């Protein structure tokens, strides 16, 4: 059974998320789904048999400990992260100095954070390997009542308690309307910036408003990509789940089926999680645009 998630040269697939006022956090996308794939393997495994159900609390205990260990490695860079937060704090709130000094400062603190993550990659890789070992150990020891007639109620339970509620939640918010509005807001800010730019003096804020507009489109392009994957994975997931639910399989096919489902979920969950976090950062920066615009109209009729 050709396992799905495995290690390779992932140089830069980091995501930065300013969710609330200066709440910087990141996510190494490949580790997030690697870990969630084996999380699904672990649960499908313990749920497979009638007796092993009760270790649901022990599994949750193990995974949470691995997260605490993973978060300890991330916490070893919090200083550089706070160093970047203050620099963004200077950029977003210009209230002298110029955009040259500030923009080059921002790029250096950002590259410094990414270099810190690169130096700690081996420590992250060990925790991920520990999760792969635990999950695949539980999966290898997966036994059946009759190897030629394996029950698929393990998959039904796992889906019904771990993935259904999401698929419904996802269809509940109408993903693509949330992007049509985002585009609407970006268009409006393009027009209201131009329709307001009639002079000089009140300039430092024209520069920062443009910057925020750019970063907001970057965030938008992500949300766009993730919603695309969520849309196609919700369909694939429902399509496939219909086939692995009410019947039996020979052991080999049952295992191959579990790996395929776990791959689908792991991805869906990953980009759903990010899609929300980026939605958070898009509006955080939108609320700050209202403040900077309003401040621009003061020095509008100050220079007249």
């Amino acid at each position: 059974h050709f396992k799905e998630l495995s290690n390779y040269n992932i140089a830069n697939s980091i995501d930065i998320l300013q969710e609330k006022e200066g709440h910087l956090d990141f996510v190494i996308i490949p580790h997030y789904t690697f870990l969630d794939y084996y999380k699904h393997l672990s649960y499908n495994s313990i749920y497979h048999k009638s007796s092993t159900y009760g270790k649901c609390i022990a599994v949750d205990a193990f995974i949470k400990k691995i997260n605490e260990a993973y978060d300890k490695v991330k916490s070893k860079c919090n200083d550089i992260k706070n160093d970047l937060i203050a620099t963004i704090k200077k950029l977003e709130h210009p209230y002298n100095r110029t955009f040259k000094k500030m923009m080059d400062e921002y790029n250096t603190k950002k590259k410094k954070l990414i270099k810190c993550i690169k130096n700690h990659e081996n420590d992250f890789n060990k925790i991920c390997m520990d999760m792969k070992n635990y999950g695949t150990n539980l999966f290898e020891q997966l036994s059946c009542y009759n190897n030629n007639f394996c029950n698929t109620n393990g998959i039904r339970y796992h889906y019904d308690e771990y993935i259904h509620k999401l698929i419904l939640s996802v269809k509940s918010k109408n993903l693509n309307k949330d992007l049509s509005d985002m585009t609407n807001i970006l268009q409006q800010s393009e027009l209201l910036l131009t329709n307001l730019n009639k002079k000089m003096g009140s300039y430092i804020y024209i520069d920062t408003i443009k910057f925020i507009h750019k970063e907001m489109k970057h965030i938008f392009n992500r949300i766009e990509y993730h919603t695309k994957i969520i849309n196609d994975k919700t369909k694939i997931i429902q399509d496939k789940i219909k086939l692995n639910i009410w019947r039996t399989f020979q052991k080999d096919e049952l295992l191959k089926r579990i790996l395929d489902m776990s791959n689908e979920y792991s991805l869906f969950i990953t980009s759903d999680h990010l899609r929300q976090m980026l939605y958070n950062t898009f509006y955080s920066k939108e609320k700050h645009l209202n403040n900077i615009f309003h401040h621009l109209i003061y020095v509008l009729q100050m220079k007249f």
Partner: antibody
Amino acid sequence: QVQLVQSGAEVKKPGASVRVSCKASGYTFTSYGISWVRQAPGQGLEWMGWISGYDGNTNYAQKLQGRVTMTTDTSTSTAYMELRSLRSDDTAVYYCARDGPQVGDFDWQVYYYYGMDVWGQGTTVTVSS
Amino acid sequence: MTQSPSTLSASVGDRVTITCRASQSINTWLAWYQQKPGKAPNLLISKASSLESGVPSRFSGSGSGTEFTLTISSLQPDDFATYFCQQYNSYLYTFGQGTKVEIRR
């Protein structure tokens, strides 16, 4: 900020009882266990007992059987240990530590390949008349 | 519950090996803790040789039955403390009496 916070030093007379608390923080108390271990002055460690924050099932050392009781408060995320009928040889430093939720379990407690990863600061208990 | 060196005299930079024998056979369960004066024990290793995170790359575990060891590849000035092994098979834990490491002159 995963940590366990214990109560302060206590001085008790023989025959009395003592209650020590261990307040969990920065983690889901209900998904982990709490073990109690004591250390007599300038000696090695002795395991006293363990209680699950999920199941509430307990495992006591034979030596302390009938005199010790461990309880839990899942609402305040606090584990308590009470030792009654105190005796001179009970003078020691008492520790609580995070552990499995199912230690004295049924077959393989293997789903936990770790053990005691977080410890309280310890509580000195002196027993003298 | 069987510590080879009761009191071990060593030097900074030396390779230190402490063996923890048992009574019966443990499949693979043996924890290793470090304890400094006035402080609580700290979990160095669990299971076979899975040193928990934050534990320096020098500490290494071993064993799979009744004979395990803890190896410090190069003793550092902050390592002079006493070391414990825990043997978790049955519901009742056993804490072998500690091993004290101090610098030889």
